[PDB]
Design a protein around this ligand. Sequence first.
Ligand SMILES: Oc1ccc(CNCc2cccs2)cc1
Length: 281
Amino acid sequence: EMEKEFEQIDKSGSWAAIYQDIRHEASDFPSRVAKLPKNKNRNRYRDVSPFDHSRIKLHQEDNDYINASLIKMEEAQRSYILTQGPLPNTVGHFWEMVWEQKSRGVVMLNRVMEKGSLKCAQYWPQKEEKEMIFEDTNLKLTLISEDIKSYYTVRQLELENLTTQETREILHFHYTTWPDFGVPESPASFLNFLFKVRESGSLSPEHGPVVVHCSAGIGRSGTFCLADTCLLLMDKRKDPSSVDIKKVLLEMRKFRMGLIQTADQLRFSYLAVIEGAKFIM
Ligand SMILES: Oc1ccc(CNCc2cccs2)cc1
């Protein structure tokens, strides 16, 4: 049982040690498309790249590249697209990806500005009457409604394909209270947020995979997917304590590098799953 594993690692202060063994054991696959000189300006960070085998391709003939990965969790029957916070020049590619993959939800785990720098382009409209048009990808995005709560904001958006005049409703889930440094003290509001995403139908197999991002698409984004998958496997299995969070993280790391950026994010992921298991058992 992970709860006893938690106390052992905590009492021995072994988090940095566990974390390094995960780093050591993590998969390494080629990222040749990401490294092509012409894709430099499509990448936020030079050391955060999608693997070629799991990368999302845009259906545009010129350049199919976006910094996004498909994470397929076969036993849990859950998929996720993890991506970076869009750049000023990739906002149109972002929405094209949402469209092409039939996603119903976008999960954002960062503020546009943190530590006095921009972590992400403002890629959705701030007012109903001021819609956004992405001329490069022929999409229009309208804010329909915005529900602001203490720890998160939910937005209903309308995405229109200007080429075919089809429209879809997209839900934007914006977790607004992740602190600038470290991790939340309590996983309560994060779990509350994760259950709200689940309740929306955004994680359901009827729809395309949910799009999840922070700034790099590996740290906070990693914590979200890791907690969701671990809780789902505990519902599914004959023995819920067969779930090993380290094995699940390593399976997820076959699809995108660097998921869970610090030993504190790892400790927080354990705390979230342990606390979430109480509300599921
Ligand atoms: O216009 C832009 C200029 C640079 C960047 C960041 N690129 C980071 C790097 C990726 C690969 C090698 S260096 C984004 C937009």
